[PDB]
Design an enzyme around this catalytic site. Structure first.
Site, PDB file in Angstrom:
ATOM      1  N   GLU A  67       0.705  -1.430  -0.307  1.00 30.85           N
ATOM      2  CA  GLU A  67       0.048   0.078  -0.240  1.00 30.85           C
ATOM      3  C   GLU A  67       0.949   1.324   0.014  1.00 30.85           C
ATOM      4  OE1 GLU A  67      -3.139   0.031  -0.669  1.00 30.85           O
ATOM      5  OE2 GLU A  67      -2.601  -2.351  -0.833  1.00 30.85           O
ATOM      6  N   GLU A  89      -2.312   9.310   0.835  1.00 35.21           N
ATOM      7  CA  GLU A  89      -2.805   8.994  -0.416  1.00 35.21           C
ATOM      8  C   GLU A  89      -2.351  10.054  -1.417  1.00 35.21           C
ATOM      9  OE1 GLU A  89      -6.601   7.734  -1.932  1.00 35.21           O
ATOM     10  OE2 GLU A  89      -6.525   8.065  -3.976  1.00 35.21           O
TER      11      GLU A  89
END
Length: 243
Positions: A67, A89
């Site tokens: 991730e 992100e």
């Protein structure tokens, strides 16, 4: 007891290049923060034999490494040395707000991916904050600014069942038993069904997938370092997504 099984030296050997290159989270993901978070989630890395305990930390660190990976095929020391390179992100298209009575979105706040599991959506920040004791709907950026809260959100996700999905913990410690529908779908215990829990909707059930392989790449490297066998059923190429 998780610090008994993974030393600071080990931790760093696995997460080798997090503090290197152009990684965005240098100095952030600390051994001490990891170990403190693990303590809040009783059972994590302390369930079963020493071998089960290693597999659990390997599997955890492997899913979260994907991730957050800054790895590439010809990266120094391999693609599987570059997990934990990011904490936020990059270039979300929205706030990840999905209107909710239970977990209402706070104005001007955004629930894009943060921390080891890149936690996303109000309906995950809400529950996670309730479990950790702090309001992450109103301050979701805490997941990107406090190293211990960051790890706590990833372990909350690890330890928590979200039906029809079991917890990643239950699967890797051998406590999960597939239902009839799970077996129809080809979902069998192992690392691969944890990938299915994380991102099965996109990654699983359609043959060989580069993302699935990347997760397995981290896992095998970490298992090797901790000196433990991989266990069965590593991929989810032939598993239908949960639903």
């Amino acid at each position: 007891s998780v610090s008994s099984i993974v030393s600071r030296a080990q931790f760093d050997r696995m997460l080798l290049h997090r503090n290197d290159g152009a990684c965005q989270a240098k100095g952030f993901y600390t051994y001490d923060a990891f170990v403190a978070a693990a303590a809040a989630f009783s059972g994590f890395g302390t369930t079963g034999s020493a071998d089960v305990q290693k597999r659990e930390v390997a599997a955890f660190l492997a899913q979260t490494s994907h991730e957050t990976t800054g790895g590439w095929a010809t990266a120094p020391d391999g693609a599987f040395a570059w997990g934990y390179c990011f904490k936020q992100e990059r270039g979300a298209s929205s706030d990840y707000c999905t209107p909710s009575a239970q977990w209402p979105c706070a104005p001007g706040k955004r629930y894009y991916g943060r921390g080891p599991i890149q936690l996303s959506h109000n309906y995950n920040y809400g529950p996670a904050g309730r479990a950790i004791g702090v309001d992450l709907l109103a301050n979701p950026d805490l997941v990107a600014t406090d190293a211990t809260v960051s790890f706590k959100t990833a372990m909350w996700f690890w330890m928590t069942a979200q039906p029809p999905k079991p917890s990643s913990h239950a699967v890797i410690v051998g406590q999960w038993s597939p239902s009839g529908a799970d077996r129809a779908a080809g979902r069998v215990p192992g690392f691969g069904v944890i990938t299915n829990i994380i991102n099965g909707g996109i990654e699983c059930g359609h043959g060989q997938d580069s993302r699935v392989a990347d997760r397995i790449g981290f896992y095998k490297r970490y298992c090797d370092i901790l000196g433990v066998g991989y266990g069965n059923n590593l991929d989810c190429y032939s598993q239908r997504p949960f639903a």
